[PDB]
């Protein structure tokens with residue numbers, strides 16, 4: 001699809017067996033999801049943005065379905081105010097910025 | 100152009116006759132720039148990012164070139180970790196997300 005930016009570019013995702021709404025975010029290096037359980041090992045990480053940093057759990061090799069497209073990669077889980085699909089998974093679904 | 104997301108979508112902007120680097124950020128509603136001087140009066144605004152809420156200076160109707168495209172609109176000035184071009188100016192340069 002072609003998504004305009006008049007409003008937030010929100011899409012439905014499936015992760016960990018759950019449906020969520022998330023932002024397609026070209027300004028995010030990584031994918032950051034609100035607190036949930038995911039299987040496997042994880043390690044702590046700190047990520048920083050406007051406001052400062054939050055501690056997250058880093059899970060690798062997680063499959064997400066993003067607007068009907070499957071990707072795999074690292075997902076960070078923690079107290080983000082919004083679910084964010086970052087560049088690590090946007091690349092996998094072939095997303096580009098066009099103007 | 101078509102910009103892929105394997106790397107940060109950094110572009111050159113020009114504001115106040117100065118060149119700066121900024122991130123095209125579809126996850127940002129607003130454009131937020133590091134401390135600089137701008138003309139006119141400003142208004143207060145609070146914005147909430149990943150790490151909490153900060154205070155910024157809101158300047159309206161500011162001339163800014165983005166990747167060689169001309170925009171005129173609201174620029175928020177404050178302690179952001181990187182200059183971010185948000186949807187208020189991404190729409191002015193005709194940007195869309197495509198996959």
Ligand SMILES: COc1ccc(S(=O)(=O)N(CC(C)C)C[C@@H](O)[C@H](Cc2ccccc2)NC(=O)O[C@@H]2C[C@@H]3[C@@H](O)CO[C@@H]3C2)cc1
Pocket residue numbers: 025027028029030031032047048049050081082084086122124125126127128129130131146147148149150180181183185
């Ligand atoms: C390492 O991976 C990372 C992934 C993401 C981030 S980041 O989220 O800090 N982040 C990294 C950027 C700052 C370099 C990604 C951004 O797109 C961020 C997304 C956002 C939206 C709403 C609430 C909170 C965050 N937008 C964001 O900070 O936008 C600001 C805050 C205000 C919100 O209402 C939405 O727009 C207004 C302008 C940092 C690191």
Ligand SMILES: [Cl-]
Pocket residue numbers: 072073074088
């Ligand atoms: Cl990854």
Ligand SMILES: [Cl-]
Pocket residue numbers: 094103
């Ligand atoms: Cl590609």
